[PDB]
Structures are given as C-alpha cells and as structure tokens.
Amino acid sequence: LAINELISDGSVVCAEALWDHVTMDDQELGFKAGDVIEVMDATNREWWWGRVADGEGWFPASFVRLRVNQDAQSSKDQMRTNVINEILSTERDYIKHLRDICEGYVRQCRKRADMFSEEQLRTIFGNIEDIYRCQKAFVKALEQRFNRERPHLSELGACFLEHQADFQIYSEYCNNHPNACVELSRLTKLSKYVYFFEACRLLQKMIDISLDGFLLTPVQKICKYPLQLAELLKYTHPQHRDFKDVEAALHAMKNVAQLINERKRRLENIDKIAQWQSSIEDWEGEDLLVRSSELIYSGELTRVTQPQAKSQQRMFFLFDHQLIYCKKDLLRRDVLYYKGRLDMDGLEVVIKNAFRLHSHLLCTRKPEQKQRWLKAFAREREQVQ
Numbered sequence: 001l002a003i004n005e006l007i008s009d010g011s012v013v014c015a016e017a018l019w020d021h022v023t024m025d026d027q028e029l030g031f032k033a034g035d036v037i038e039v040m041d042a043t044n045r046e047w048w049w050g051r052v053a054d055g056e057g058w059f060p061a062s063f064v065r066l067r068v069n070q071d072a073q074s075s076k077d078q079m080r081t082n083v084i085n086e087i088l089s090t091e092r093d094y095i096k097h098l099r100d101i102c103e104g105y106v107r108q109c110r111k112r113a114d115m116f117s118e119e120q121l122r123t124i125f126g127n128i129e130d131i132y133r134c135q136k137a138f139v140k141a142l143e144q145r146f147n148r149e150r151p152h153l154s155e156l157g158a159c160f161l162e163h164q165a166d167f168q169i170y171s172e173y174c175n176n177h178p179n180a181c182v183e184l185s186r187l188t189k190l191s192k193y194v195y196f197f198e199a200c201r202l203l204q205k206m207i208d209i210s211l212d213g214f215l216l217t218p219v220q221k222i223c224k225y226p227l228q229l230a231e232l233l234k235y236t237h238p239q240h241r242d243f244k245d246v247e248a249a250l251h252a253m254k255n256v257a258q259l260i261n262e263r264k265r266r267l268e269n270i271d272k273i274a275q276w277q278s279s280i281e282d283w284e285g286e287d288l289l290v291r292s293s294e295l296i297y298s299g300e301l302t303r304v305t306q307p308q309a310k311s312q313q314r315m316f317f318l319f320d321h322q323l324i325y326c327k328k329d330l331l332r333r334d335v336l337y338y339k340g341r342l343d344m345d346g347l348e349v350v351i352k353n354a355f356r357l358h359s360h361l362l363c364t365r366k367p368e369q370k371q372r373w374l375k376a377f378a379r380e381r382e383q384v385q
C-alpha cells in the first residue's frame with residue numbers, strides 16, 4: 001500500500017508479471033509472464049495503470065509482483081536482505097491463507113455432506129490440504145535457515161531444492177482450478193450456499209478476500225516463486241554460499257511455473273476470444289474458435305479500400321490464422337462493430353505495408369507501430385509453422 005505515495009512523489013515503481021495478461025481492450029495492458037511493468041497509478045484496489053514498451057493501459061495488480069528493491073557492500077547486503085525478508089514474509093502470509101481455507105472452509109464443508117459431496121469437496125478444494133501440510137514444513141525449513149543477526153547470509157536455495165517434489169503437487173491443484181471456479185460460480189448463484197459461505201467467514205474471522213481469492217493464492221504463489229528467486233539471485237554475490245543453489249532453485253521453479261502458466265494462458269485465450277467475439281456488434285463470418293485459438297497482436301491500423309480508393313482507420317486484431325478488423329463506435333470507444341477479415345494462410349507481408357497472395361494496403365502513424373506489426377506477423381507465421 002506504500003506504493004500510493006511513491007507514485008505521487010513521481011518515483012518510478014516497477015513490478016514483474018507473474019501470469020500472462022490477455023486482452024483485446026485497447027485501454028488495457030497486455031503482457032506475458034516475466035515482463036517488467038512500470039506502475040503509474042494504483043488508485044484502484046485491483047486495476048492499476050501501467051506502461052511497458054509499445055504502450056500503457058489498465059492491468060490487474062494481482063497478476064504482478066513488485067520488485068523488492070526499486071531505487072557499496074553495506075548497501076548491497078541490505079538489498080539481498082530485503083528480498084530474504086520478503087520471501088519469508090510472503091510465506092508467513094501464504095500459510096495464514098491456507099490455514100483459513102482448511103480450517104475455515106474445508107473443515108466446515110466436509111461436515112455438511114448434505115451440501116457438499118465428496119466430489120464437490122474435491123472439485124472445489126483440490127489437494128489444498130496437501131499443499132497446506134507441505135507449506136507448513138517448508139515455512140519451518142525456511143525459517144531455520146534464517147540468519148537473524150546477518151540476514152543477507154541466509155541460505156535458502158538448498159531449501160527450495162530439497163522441496164522440489166513437494167512443489168510438484170501444485171500441478172494437480174492448478175490443473176483442477178478451472179473446475180473449482182466453475183463449481184464456485186454455480187454455487188454463487190444459490191442463496192443457501194452464499195449464506196453458508198458467509199457464515200464460514202463470520203466464525204473464522206478471515207482476511208477480507210472472497211473464497212475465489214483464497215483459492216487463487218496457490219496459483220499465484222507458485223508462479224511468484226520464480227520472481228522472488230530471481231531478485232534473490234540478482235543480489236547474491238557471484239561466490240555466495242547460496243549462489244549456486246539459488247540459481248538452481250530458480251531453474252527448477254521456472255520449469256514448474258511455466259507449465260502452470262502456459263496452461264492458464266491457453267485456457268484464458270479460448271474464453272477471452274469467445275467472450276470478445278460476443279461483445280462485438282454485428283459479427284458476420286465464421287466463429288474465431290473454429291480456426292483460431294490465440295490473439296497474436298492487436299491495435300489500430302488504417303487500411304485503404306482498394307475496390308475504390310478511400311482509406312479508413314480501424315481496430316485490427318491478428319489471431320493465429322486470421323486478421324479481423326472492426327470500427328470503433330464514434331462516441332463510445334468500448335463499442336466495436338465487425339467489418340471484415342482476412343486469411344493469413346497464404347498471405348505474405350512486404351509507416352505502411354501490404355498483404356500478398358492472389359493485395360491489401362495498411363499503415364499506421366508511427367514507424368514504431370509498423371515495426372511492431374511486422375513482428376506480430378512474423379510471430380503469427382511462427383506459431384503457425
């Protein structure tokens with residue numbers, strides 16, 4: 001929450017994306033897990049305004065992690081010590097969420113077989129109870145490595161390394177998570193469940209987050225780890241006792257978050273695309289999901305009607321295999337009207353450019369924008385080949 005003031009003083013606040021953010025709204029910021037994001041406004045609880053390279057726009061905060069050290073041996077040790085303290089702080093908080101879930105929610109549900117079947121409990125909670133048992137041990141092992149007197153000397157890499165297999169159980173959790181959300185959404189629509197769940201919180205005295213927020217913490221945590229180990233390494237001496245292990249812990253934790261993240265990414269594209277198409281006015285040809293599964297790049301572009309000669313600016317949207325184009329409702333930006341599309345299969349590219357098959361003419365207002373489109377297209381043919 002201290003971020004409120006740093007941005008007001010004009011200070012430069014950076015963060016890093018733990019999940020990919022997928023969007024077609026030209027006012028929202030899209031990024032891939034791991035990208036650095038400058039947060040310029042954090043007025044809102046969740047939707048902050050940010051900036052990367054080719055742009056800025058709104059983005060969810062819960063999707064990013066703030067660098068511990070924003071802005072020579074006493075200082076350099078203090079930095080590593082900051083990360084060390086964050087790691088330890090986030091595990092202490094994360095264990096409180098898991099405890100609140102298991103003792104405040106699960107325990108209760110499992111005691112009301114008349115509302116939850118064994119199947120539902122498994123669908124809603126997954127293996128959250130196993131995650132809770134392992135994390136309690138992990139916290140204990142992290143803390144025993146903590147050098148209270150001289151923090152920066154704490155060795156944590158080996159500790160991550162010793163729990164490798166244990167972090168493997170996040171796959172099951174994250175894999176079943178989409179299903180939990182569906183059952184939850186459903187139950188959300190049933191007064192008797194809405195009440196029982198509220199009654200759950202009014203007895204466990206719980207953090208003020210919804211059941212949906214809680215159930216997402218394990219997915220965030222596992223995907224956050226690579227960011228934490230990474231900033232730890234950045235401040236670990238090239239010859240620290242911990243150096244080798246951290247670098248190792250990082251490598252292994254990436255392999256886990258990457259799979260979890262890619263899956264989450266593939267699934268969100270499917271739904272964003274469907275939801276998107278639907279929000280669009282006067283849709284015409286075949287549905288996007290028929291030939292597509294991923295938005296490669298989007299953004300304003302002006303095409304020039306070759307039948308006659310008029311040129312119009314439109315919001316183009318390149319997916320794998322096809323380029324759609326829409327016109328923004330003058331006096332209501334949020335409203336788009338379908339206008340057409342093209343089949344990237346067969347089409348070639350050669351602040352203006354054209355498509356070749358048989359051509360189509362297009363251009364922007366800034367050299368920067370063109371060079372970025374050329375990428376999108378090259379990436380488009382790479383995801384295709």
